[PDB]
Ligand binder design. Structure first.
Ligand SMILES: CC(C)CN(C[C@@H](O)[C@H](Cc1ccccc1)NC(=O)O[C@H]1CO[C@H]2OCC[C@H]21)S(=O)(=O)c1ccc(N)cc1
Lengths: 99, 99
């Protein structure tokens, strides 16, 4: 289907056995989530946004259910003020912009 | 047009006769541009993202042209590291997410 943009485009994602709300964000290179536990190895990374830099944990090959897709992706975890779904995950599920 | 998300979705915009590259960003509530001069009244605003807050100037009713679509909308100006087109302008040009 389609999603208009009069409202913030939140979708529900299933990740780590939890249901979370996340913003579909074409301006984000990567998917960044608020503090949570995920299993497996991680490596520290710096993420920079409009207000400055934050430290995050990078988890690879995390399964995520999103918009009827069973996806697998890299996920960054840290002090973001909102869960964002970035182009890494948007491309995997075939999302595009159209006007 | 249609725009995939394997690369950052930059488009050329025209504002006040000036050509600029901006990111099409569904996570951004409102268009934010790097420091520039615009005419008319403004009011300060605070916007927040990854890494914290910034102060911007809000100009209302500014003409902006994007891929042949003309709009008159609110434009924020401040220390963003890149030009961002937000949902306020995406909606006015009929842009949607599709998958
Ligand atoms: C955090 C979002 C809810 C809001 N942001 C839009 C978002 O697309 C920014 C837009 C953005 C893009 C580049 C640089 C700064 C901000 N991208 C972002 O922070 O992504 C980071 C995660 O992936 C990495 O790839 C880009 C930076 C990292 S935002 O820049 O703070 C913002 C907030 C409000 C408005 N009106 C305009 C923009």
């Amino acid at each position: 289907p389609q999603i208009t943009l009069w409202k913030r485009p939140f979708v529900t994602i299933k990740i780590g056995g939890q249901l979370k709300e996340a913003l579909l964000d074409t301006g984000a290179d990567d998917t960044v989530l608020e503090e949570m536990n995920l299993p497996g190895r991680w490596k520290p990374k710096i993420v920079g946004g409009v207000g400055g830099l934050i430290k995050v944990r990078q988890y690879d090959q995390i399964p995520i259910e999103i918009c009827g897709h069973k996806a697998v992706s890299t996920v960054l975890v840290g002090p973001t003020p909102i869960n964002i779904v970035g182009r890494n995950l948007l491309t995997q599920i075939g999302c595009t912009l159209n006007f």
